[PDB]
């Protein structure tokens, strides 16, 4: 028995039972629940993140990734009162939870680190960029007004010219939305090919044992399902892609 970990999450404008949504933060929430570690959520809205980080003393995760000159403060962040430690960046948190609690199933063993880093770069071009003009426009009006104004302005300032300016132009219903939906499906099919490269259909990257890179894929899937709604026609298609493999993974991480 130990104290509840402090898990800093980003809310949308919904009641608390439905307030979690974010892809990156879900990596850590799913890491905590896989390890069955007790936690409480502490909600921080987008425009308050760096201030809230600076006050509890969590490091930034990257540098100049929004404004070239200043560090990038992000969620997830955990504070573990059992050790007094504050950790930011979902992968740094996972290692922390591996080392602090060896009883829990290890998620990122040393043997996985370089291959998972390969995956993060593969996943960026293959899944994240095809998915971005879908998830981001859809999550934006779900935020409360201050969060939406910060989310819209920062993400339009960064990905704006690469996609078509304002978020309504990213995937507008028509030939635009059709082509991007195609390239998103291709990316998931490419990713299923990695999983079946030996001629079999393993459930997880390592085989039957699950690790952090399965959590990562699940976190983004859980985000799309939470943001679109589990009966949205575009989520219902994702459920069927590649033999329903993505549906099986979501089932796995939901039942952690």
Ligand X SMILES: N[C@@H](CCC(=O)N[C@@H](CS)C(=O)NCC(=O)O)C(=O)O
Applying CB under 6 A, which residues contact ligand X? 10, 22, 24, 27, 46, 49, 61, 74-76, 89-90, 154
Instruction: Specify the 3-state DSSP secondary structure of 5.
Output: strand
Partner from its own copies, ligand X, none binding residue 118, C-beta < 5-8 Å depending on class: its own copies
Q: Which of 102, 122, 140, 103 is nearest to 188 (CA)?
A: 122
Is the CB of residue 87 less than 8 Å from the CB of residue 78? yes
Interaction of residue 116 with its own copies, rule CB under 8 A: yes
Measured CA to CA, the distance from residue 31 to residue 210 in angstroms comes to 11
Please pick, from the candidates 2, 62, 65, 118, the single residue that binds its own copies as defined by CB under 8 A: 118
75 in Cβ contact with 10 (< 8 Å):
yes
Contact characters 161-190, its own copies, x per CB under 8 A: -----------------------------x
CB crowding 101-110: b at 16 or more within 10 Å, else e: beeeebbbee
- Does 129 contact its own copies by CB under 8 A? no
Other Cβ atoms within 10 Å of 37 Cβ, number: 20
Q: Smaller CB distance to ligand X: residue 205 or 220?
A: 220
Is the Cβ of residue 135 or residue 249 nearer to ligand X in the bound state? 135
238 binds, among its own copies, ligand X, none (CB under 5 to 8 A by kind): none
Taking CB under 8 A as the rule, does residue 1 contact its own copies?
Answer: no
| Burial environment of residue 174 by CB neighbours within 10 A (0 to 12, 13 to 18, 19 or more) | exposed
Task: Let me know: does 76 contact 25? Beta carbons within 8 Å.
Answer: yes
Would you say 75 is a known binding-site residue?
A: yes
Q: 210: which 2 tokens?
A: 């699950």
Minimum Å distance from CB 194 to its own copies? 4
Site residues for its own copies, 195-254, by CB under 8 A, read 195, 197-198, 202, 205-207, 209, 213
Judged by beta carbon, residue 122 or residue 176, the one nearer its own copies is: 122
Min. distance of Cβ 46 from ligand X in angstroms?
5
The piece of 16-24, 117-125, 235-243, 245-253 that touches its own copies (CB under 8 A) is 117-125
φ, ψ for residue 216 (rounded to 5)? Answer: -60, -50
Binding residues for glutathione: 22, 24, 27, 46, 72, 75, 90, 150, 155
């Amino acid at each position: 028995m130990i104290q509840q970990i402090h898990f800093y999450d980003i809310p949308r404008n919904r009641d608390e039972d439905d307030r979690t949504w974010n892809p990156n933060t879900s990596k850590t929430r799913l890491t905590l629940t896989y390890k069955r570690l007790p936690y409480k959520t502490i909600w921080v809205e987008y425009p308050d993140i760096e201030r809230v980080c600076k006050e509890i003393g969590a490091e930034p995760s990257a540098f100049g990734l929004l404004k070239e000159g200043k560090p990038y403060y992000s969620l997830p962040v955990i504070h573990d009162p059992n050790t007094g430690t504050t950790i930011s960046d979902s992968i740094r948190i996972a290692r922390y939870l591996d080392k602090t609690y060896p009883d829990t199933p290890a998620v990122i063993p040393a043997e996985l680190e370089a291959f998972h880093a390969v995956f993060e770069d593969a996943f960026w071009d293959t899944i994240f960029m095809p998915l971005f003009p879908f998830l981001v426009p859809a999550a934006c009006p779900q935020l409360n007004p201050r969060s939406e104004a910060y989310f819209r302005e920062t993400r339009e300032g960064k990905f704006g010219s690469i996609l078509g300016g304002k978020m309504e132009n990213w995937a507008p219903t028509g030939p635009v939305r059709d082509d991007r939906w195609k390239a998103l499906q291709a990316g998931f099919t490419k990713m299923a090919g990695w999983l079946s490269a030996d001629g079999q259909e393993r459930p997880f990257f390592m085989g039957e044992k699950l690790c952090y890179t399965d959590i990562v894929v699940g976190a983004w899937l859980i985000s799309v399902k939470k943001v679109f709604g589990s009966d949205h026609p575009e989520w219902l298609q994702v459920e069927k892609w590649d033999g329903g493999r993505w549906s099986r993974l979501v089932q796995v991480v939901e039942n952690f």
